């Protein structure tokens with residue numbers, strides 16, 4: 362290896378290009394994740410050849426490149442799976458398909474159209490937490506996908522699949538962390554509901 366650096370700068374230049382694109386095409390995002398794998402494959406290689414730097418850039422530990430390459434594969438795979446469905450032609454932003462969002466509740470589900478939910482604990486203006494409720498959640502099933510919606514009640518934020526209600530934000534747990542009483546007020550939209 363020798364052109365490793367010339368190849369890495371071309372990859373990172375490409376990543377910057379993909380970022381700037383600000384595309385809504387799920388397929389560009391899949392290609393973006395493939396390039397993240399390429400970058401980490403090259404940085405991982407560079408660390409093995411003993412290199413410490415590549416044009417001002419610091420070569421990361423093998424464990425870091427291994428971790429990014431792994432996350433990139435997971436993202437790429439789930440996106441391609443979702444891409445084989447009626448949902449894949451919908452608009453998908455770079456943010457909607459990030460690992461960051463993937464790990465945001467509900468974890469390991471895709472989601473879109475987030476809205477704000479405020480919870481005031483005890484009834485003290487300075488005790489207000491903000492949460493997100495997603496209008497569209499895509500749940501995985503083997504290799505098929507299901508589109509569901511969210512709702513809010515005195516107990517928390519949840520999505521409905523059939524007769525099952527799954528909460529991705531528990532208002533009682535939140536209380537034990539930012540409140541002292543088991544009394545709280547919830548506000549989303551023009552709607553308000555208080556804990557009993």
Ligand SMILES: Cc1ccc2c(c1)C(=O)[C@]1(O[C@@H](c3ccc(Cl)c(Cl)c3)[C@@H](C(=O)Nc3ccc(-c4csnn4)cc3)[C@H]1C(=O)O)C2=O
Pocket residue numbers: 397424425426428429430432433460
């Ligand atoms: C301009 C610009 C400005 C800010 C950022 C970037 C670019 C990025 O690419 C960054 O996004 C992250 C990331 C980018 C891509 C992916 Cl896949 C992920 Cl998970 C995060 C991160 C990153 O690499 N996070 C990370 C932290 C710890 C580990 C690790 C593994 S084992 N021990 N530590 C690995 C990655 C970081 C980055 O690559 O520098 C980030 O914060």
Ligand SMILES: Cc1ccc2c(c1)C(=O)[C@]1(O[C@@H](c3ccc(Cl)c(Cl)c3)[C@@H](C(=O)Nc3ccc(-c4csnn4)cc3)[C@H]1C(=O)O)C2=O
Pocket residue numbers: 380390391393394397455456458459460461462
């Ligand atoms: C398809 C595609 C392909 C590769 C990547 C993405 C998307 C990303 O979003 C990633 O960009 C990172 C980043 C990390 C920091 C910087 Cl500054 C830059 Cl440019 C890139 C990082 C990251 O932190 N992104 C991120 C996305 C959304 C939010 C957000 C905004 S409002 N709610 N959530 C925050 C972070 C990471 C990731 O988590 O996926 C990335 O490497």
